[PDB]
Amino acid sequence: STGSATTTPIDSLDDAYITPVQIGTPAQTLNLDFDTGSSDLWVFSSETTASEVXQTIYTPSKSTTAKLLSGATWSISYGDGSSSSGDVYTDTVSVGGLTVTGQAVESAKKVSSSFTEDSTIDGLLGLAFSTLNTVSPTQQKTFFDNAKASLDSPVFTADLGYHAPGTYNFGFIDTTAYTGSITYTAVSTKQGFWEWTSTGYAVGSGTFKSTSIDGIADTGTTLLYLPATVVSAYWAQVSGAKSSSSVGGYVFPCSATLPSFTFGVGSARIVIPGDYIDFGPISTGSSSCFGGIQSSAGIGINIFGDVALKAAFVVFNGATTPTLGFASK
């Protein structure tokens, strides 16, 4: 089997992308954030504290196929310190025509304020490895893990757009979706992430520096976070750029034309256009813009987020030995 779904930026800045998911019988459609940085399927629901609800909710009691998962609970927090918790049902879940029965659907009893504040995201769909799932006492498999037995091929691809819709595909590779050939690189699952090592970087039309950059492919993260020296090397090529404490990152005049950024994938090269790195003005009408490449120093991990991934066609190969594939598009 296969599935194909359209993914849309939640705002004009491509802060995040939401993909429609059908849950339950008859189907309830929710807009979930597909997150390759986590492994929990959780949604806003009829069980969520009402003052914490502003989103479309899941109502388990309206689904004929929902089943309470007795004694199971979950609790999760993310990179930005936001969090949610609750109990667990299994239900039928469909994405772009691909249907999984008995999928664990984590029902939120409580959510942090940033989740309440964002009206466009109804929940998250985790696509990292299942060892990161927070359900206890027994961890639950991700949507991808459950689908693998039925997929034509054990893969999914991300094709995220710049200020435009994109596609998530399951179980097949759309050869009309990219140019050139796909380059595959090995994945480490030791920490449960789609973790890989880039072979180096170039700024604009300068030289490619071979240097290992271990990082994770995280569709749930907006920007590109790289080691400080790499990031310094980039912004040095932007004459009015500087680091801003008040803002917490590099900023530059919105009028500047930004250099491209290239990262290595084995012997291949992926070029992020300068325009993708112009993330947006710090406030509407402002003459200063926020940069899309920032230091990973206070995070502890390098993160290849949407800024980076939307410049490529990305293949998440979930075979027993998983790999990452990148193509130019």
């Binding site: 995040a16 390759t36 940033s114 964002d118």
Partner: peptide, 8 residues
Amino acid sequence: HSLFHXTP
């Protein structure tokens, strides 16, 4: 709407 960092 914020900037998003999806889990440690």
